[PDB]
Design a protein around this ligand. Sequence first.
Ligand SMILES: NC(=O)c1ccc[n+]([C@@H]2O[C@H](COP(=O)([O-])OP(=O)(O)OC[C@H]3O[C@@H](n4cnc5c(N)ncnc54)[C@H](O)[C@@H]3O)[C@@H](O)[C@H]2O)c1
Ligand SMILES: NC(=O)c1ccc[n+]([C@@H]2O[C@H](COP(=O)([O-])OP(=O)(O)OC[C@H]3O[C@@H](n4cnc5c(N)ncnc54)[C@H](O)[C@@H]3O)[C@@H](O)[C@H]2O)c1
Ligand SMILES: NC(=O)c1ccc[n+]([C@@H]2O[C@H](COP(=O)([O-])OP(=O)(O)OC[C@H]3O[C@@H](n4cnc5c(N)ncnc54)[C@H](O)[C@@H]3O)[C@@H](O)[C@H]2O)c1
Ligand SMILES: NC(=O)c1ccc[n+]([C@@H]2O[C@H](COP(=O)([O-])OP(=O)(O)OC[C@H]3O[C@@H](n4cnc5c(N)ncnc54)[C@H](O)[C@@H]3O)[C@@H](O)[C@H]2O)c1
Lengths: 366, 366, 366, 366
Amino acid sequence: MIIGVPKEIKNNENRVAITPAGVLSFVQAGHTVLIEKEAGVGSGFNDSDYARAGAQIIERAEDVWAQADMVMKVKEPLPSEYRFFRPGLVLFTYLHLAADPELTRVLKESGVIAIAYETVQVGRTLPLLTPMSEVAGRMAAQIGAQFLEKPYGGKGILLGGVPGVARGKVVIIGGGVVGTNAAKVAVGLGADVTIIDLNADRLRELDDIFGNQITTLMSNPMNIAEAVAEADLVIGAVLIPKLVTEDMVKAMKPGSVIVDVAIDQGGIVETSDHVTTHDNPTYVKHGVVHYAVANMPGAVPRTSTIALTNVTIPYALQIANKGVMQAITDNPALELGVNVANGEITYEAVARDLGYRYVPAREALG
Amino acid sequence: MIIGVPKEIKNNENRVAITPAGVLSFVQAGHTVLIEKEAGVGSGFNDSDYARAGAQIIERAEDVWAQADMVMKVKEPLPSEYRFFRPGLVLFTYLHLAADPELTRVLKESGVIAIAYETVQVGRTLPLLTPMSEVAGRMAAQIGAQFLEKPYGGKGILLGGVPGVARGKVVIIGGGVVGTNAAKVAVGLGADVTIIDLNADRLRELDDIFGNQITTLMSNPMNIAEAVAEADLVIGAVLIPKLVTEDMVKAMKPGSVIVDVAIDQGGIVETSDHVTTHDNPTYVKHGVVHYAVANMPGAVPRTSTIALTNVTIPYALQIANKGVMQAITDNPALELGVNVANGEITYEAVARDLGYRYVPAREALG
Amino acid sequence: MIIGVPKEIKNNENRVAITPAGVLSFVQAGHTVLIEKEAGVGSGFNDSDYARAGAQIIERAEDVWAQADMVMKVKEPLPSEYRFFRPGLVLFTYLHLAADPELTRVLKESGVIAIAYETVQVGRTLPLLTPMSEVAGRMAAQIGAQFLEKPYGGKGILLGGVPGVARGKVVIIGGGVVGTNAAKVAVGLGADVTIIDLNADRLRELDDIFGNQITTLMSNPMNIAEAVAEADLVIGAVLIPKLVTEDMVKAMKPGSVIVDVAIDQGGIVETSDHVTTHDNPTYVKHGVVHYAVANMPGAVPRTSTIALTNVTIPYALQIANKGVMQAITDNPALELGVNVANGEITYEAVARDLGYRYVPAREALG
Amino acid sequence: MIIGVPKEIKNNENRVAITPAGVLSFVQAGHTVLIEKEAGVGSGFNDSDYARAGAQIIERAEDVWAQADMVMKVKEPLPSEYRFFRPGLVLFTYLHLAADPELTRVLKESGVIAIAYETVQVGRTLPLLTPMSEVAGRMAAQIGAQFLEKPYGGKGILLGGVPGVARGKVVIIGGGVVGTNAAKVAVGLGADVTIIDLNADRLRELDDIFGNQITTLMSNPMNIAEAVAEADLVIGAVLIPKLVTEDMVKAMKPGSVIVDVAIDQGGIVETSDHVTTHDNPTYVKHGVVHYAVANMPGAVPRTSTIALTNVTIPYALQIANKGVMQAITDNPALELGVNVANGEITYEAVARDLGYRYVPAREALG
Ligand SMILES: NC(=O)c1ccc[n+]([C@@H]2O[C@H](COP(=O)([O-])OP(=O)(O)OC[C@H]3O[C@@H](n4cnc5c(N)ncnc54)[C@H](O)[C@@H]3O)[C@@H](O)[C@H]2O)c1
Ligand SMILES: NC(=O)c1ccc[n+]([C@@H]2O[C@H](COP(=O)([O-])OP(=O)(O)OC[C@H]3O[C@@H](n4cnc5c(N)ncnc54)[C@H](O)[C@@H]3O)[C@@H](O)[C@H]2O)c1
Ligand SMILES: NC(=O)c1ccc[n+]([C@@H]2O[C@H](COP(=O)([O-])OP(=O)(O)OC[C@H]3O[C@@H](n4cnc5c(N)ncnc54)[C@H](O)[C@@H]3O)[C@@H](O)[C@H]2O)c1
Ligand SMILES: NC(=O)c1ccc[n+]([C@@H]2O[C@H](COP(=O)([O-])OP(=O)(O)OC[C@H]3O[C@@H](n4cnc5c(N)ncnc54)[C@H](O)[C@@H]3O)[C@@H](O)[C@H]2O)c1
């Protein structure tokens, strides 16, 4: 198979859907990899690095997509890329089709086999989304610390204090992948950290991981109100009626900070109702700084690329070795990735949400 | 030399001034040790244990004191023991002579060489008092936890909480030997622990020992007021105008507990103005339980005996090998131990406080 | 729905089946909550706290039970409360019906829908019993430390020793919820801690949680005999022929302590054959102190109330929102809670043990 | 005595030379404190907070300086404040007189008793500079992490990586107060941290503090070259020929970051030859981002104020209680603070460096 990785073109997107490590996995298993010029550079991988791993460097986006059996990306194709679609092309990337009626329609009618990173799933987890959740949680505590600096609108404290000075209070809401990764960094900055979760077994697991390094708190509206009022930094760690209400935010001390990782989806914090750009990253409501930039992992493209590609490529490699049909037969997790194939919407919830007829991927590809 | 160790006779005193380990140190260096029957039993050392180490077991208190060159004890001789004094007798024990005008007078006029554990001193520390300070601090957090149990008058919490439940707040005032030993146990019980100290370098040392396991807080009246109000347990760790005022105690939550280790000396907590017995161990003022039992180390006599004897006997052994005069010549720390010799008060502060003429121990023994 | 929470009336029962946090969960979801006067006070929640959360404060027990659709408690109704039963009343509390033939008969014939906290079950665990197991294990190490104090009959040591003095040996038998919670506190007190378990995978899990902070030991009679003989404190952490025999206890050092958490059920320690009250808390057999007070969590009512209510109320809230029938249809864990409904014994093992006809709760409620 | 604390007027200076805690120390000891409006607000202390502690709030800078015996500040008086000087006025603040020939001349000829925080000294340490060193080191690792984000010019990594991804390399040069505080935060962010120091005993002390959490490396030019080349982040932790050479920086990987805490004094990094403002915070040389903003502690004014005032006020309080002459007689550390009194330069190194006659402070004040 021939695999192609164009440079990401969305604004300030510095990640890339393969690394030299990925190229070498494909080349060792008999395959050919094409990389557009400067694809890796935002993630500090140069054309020479990809070439040394055994890839061909391709001048023009167009020739990568045209010469490849499968294109891998990080983001969704933009309209400027619809031109490169073709029947039987495999596209492997983050798609978010349920919220992109238009992209779905063009993929469907262009004959694309479109595989979504975010719907590959083993049990209750999505293994190709986990890496960005992890990165996101690590980032949240770091960004929280930055916006607690007076120059960025914060009340001007260190989470760790210094000897003889009290520590900052970090309240994390949600103790899964995002929250657990945030708690590691917030404990490392020297904060008093409290992790709030609905699920008492998850709190027991966190008590076995963290011990005395944190406080675990059952999630209910009084526990959240009381915790958030005392908090220097609140981290909304629940990606999925709002858990932190305007009245709760109103009770917070001026110059406190709120980082809500689900800001793109509305958030769990009522006051965090809108997103913002890198150049205008916060707004203040009731004296409280709200960090509104989405795609935190986007701020550490090199970590985010390696974490993503560490888990995407072993899936991509099944497709290269076996072709899509055998790969999704052999691997039910990959099967749930196929959103579009051969004229049909092949993922139930996308079909339902947008009004097409669910057609199973295996059936669709016959 | 012949060394004698009577059984302690003060009420419920279970410690003892030597262990088999001590006996064996003396016997190996040429000496004879006498132990009264049941001397060690409150500390779980039996006559057979002392005998196996090479000691003689003596039926009657009187014969131990009469046959011995030096008697070692833990407490001060009671009036019931003045009868056993004699000129040239060495007594090595805890004396507290500055606060016992009467005992001092009888020791002076009986011709006793009286050596106080608590005035042996190297630099700024008293090495034969350190062990009871350590034991005391370890005990304070344990006793604090007990009196936070509802049956003992406390509000009924675990310092550690359980998963999903907040931890208790322990505020320790004083970050030296007592406080540092208390913080180890309070952190181990799972409390949020704050250590308050005047000395910013000591707070830096505690931050290097404990890291993120505690909060260090500079000592001033607002820091103490604010910390004590939030505290489930306050531990007064300063042995030396009161640091915790009635108004501060009044702001505390009902069922909170105060353990003040200097209760014998007045305390640093205004409300803790009196001491109490094991059978009536607390009183409540403003809803706050005050643990009033003195001699905490007395509750763990076996640990307290071993910790004491580990450091008293190497000093006692210099006296056995060299006689008092050479021992105090060779060892200035031991010299400062001699409070009474040969008619004179040989420790300045005792002479001053009680109105006798300071006479140096070396001069006094000539 | 109207929910009522009387004050617990068993002797010295200071817990309570709801907190302001619970009240607010019910009020936000459309419900009415009634609280009898002084219900929360043993757990340090006042009528004003419940009122501020949106509850009505009710003068007389009788009016709470009469005006409520569902009564929540901690303990079983006493005979003095049979008067308040009525057909169609929901009672949610700890029942222990298999061991209370009489209570079961009155609940059956009074027409009560009786739901037992202790038989709600997900897989192999009982989620509404877990919190008291956790509290119990945390308490066991603390009580162990207390009874090792000479005034309480112990040999007079600190588990942690002090510098230059050996640590105490804690042997915990059973490495599940109770034992794991005890090991956290015993390690925190500075003990040498050994955890004995039958299940080598649980020992591997404990080695990953605790590392070098403990010794894991396979459970067999020689490992237990040898461990218990060396132990200052033994904690029986197995709730379910006796694992510690009289001969094993006989080999222990005088002034050692045994806390057996299953004392109510006979225990795993042969010598611990009877229970005792707070005022007479131990007996000595073969020189070994046996702590015989049951209901350890009862000594920290405030922690125990919050830990219980953190998990009981989300179940109670399904009943309030959906009524018993829909709640147990939708939630098999809650279903296994229903012990008595509408004339029938609706929990197999209660029916079998007491000689009634098992009738499924859904069938029974038709 | 009357103490006055004006609002700091240097650009973006948000610290303040007293807190309510400080006010209360002064008021309890008989003194009067004046605070200008909005003095504390950059540090989140409001006029109401100072008033509640017992201070008078003063409308105009001028009236604070005129009515006060002693003015306390954080920064040096600006020219705009020379007007408020007067003979016999005590000024207590950070002065840096050796590098301010002009300020020194005006203080001398205005008759000011000028006491420098930064020359109070006990042994080899300056206790009123320690707090900003601590804050500075804590900040350096946090700022380092920020500038490793791609949007701030960095190569785009997390220091901690995520599971399956390598950690970032932090190299700290200097293992004293600044470096040790940086290492705590860099270890907490999950970096591989190496601390370089000349002094092998300091490396032994760091190995006892940190254990396996760091690598200690002896300082020599090859160790530094090799460490810096492998480093994602270098922190210059030496306040005092350059330790990191342009050739060493040239060998670093593009998008690496250098935070040199002595940037104000020239730095230990050759490439870091100039300082920059908050709005233009870095420059790139040889692909390496150089953070050039000075006064890091200035970014966390509230922590910095509390850490400073925790140690300045106990010195200020000796002056209030005893007057300058007795205070500096009784306290040699404070004595070395007096830089200017009563016409003379009273600190040797200032006199020498600027060409005046050293006159001892006690002599000068006669
Ligand atoms: N698309 C999704 O959001 C989704 C759904 C299921 C699982 N996942 C998996 O988890 C990752 C996403 O990270 P995540 O940390 O947000 O999810 P997660 O499942 O790892 O954790 C979410 C946590 O939030 C807790 N929670 C839910 N409601 C809460 C409330 N009201 N109050 C407090 N806590 C509450 C849950 O108990 C859980 O522990 C993905 O990488 C995937 O592996 C994703
Ligand atoms: N007899 C004494 O009380 C005495 C005096 C000097 C040293 N020591 C040594 O210390 C042991 C006694 O233990 P200790 O822990 O009480 O003494 P310690 O000297 O070890 O510690 C006392 C601590 O209290 C702090 N402190 C003092 N005033 C304070 C205040 N107002 N607010 C907050 N902190 C304050 C000090 O800075 C110090 O760190 C003895 O074993 C001996 O070695 C004894
Ligand atoms: N009613 C019960 O006793 C019961 C039964 C099943 C599970 N549970 C769950 O566990 C909690 C009760 O706590 P727990 O810690 O007693 O139970 P647990 O299941 O958490 O742990 C008991 C432990 O004892 C060990 N064990 C059993 N026999 C042993 C032996 N002979 N020697 C040594 N170890 C032995 C088991 O391997 C297990 O690890 C409840 O909260 C519930 O969640 C309860
Ligand atoms: N004004 C000063 O710079 C100064 C001088 C002496 C002490 N101090 C004290 O220290 C604080 C200042 O912080 P700091 O951390 O910079 O000083 P510090 O004295 O705490 O530490 C500096 C460290 O740098 C190390 N070092 C020196 N030359 C080195 C080299 N070539 N390579 C590697 N390591 C080297 C030293 O061994 C020392 O451990 C002040 O708060 C004060 O307490 C200040």
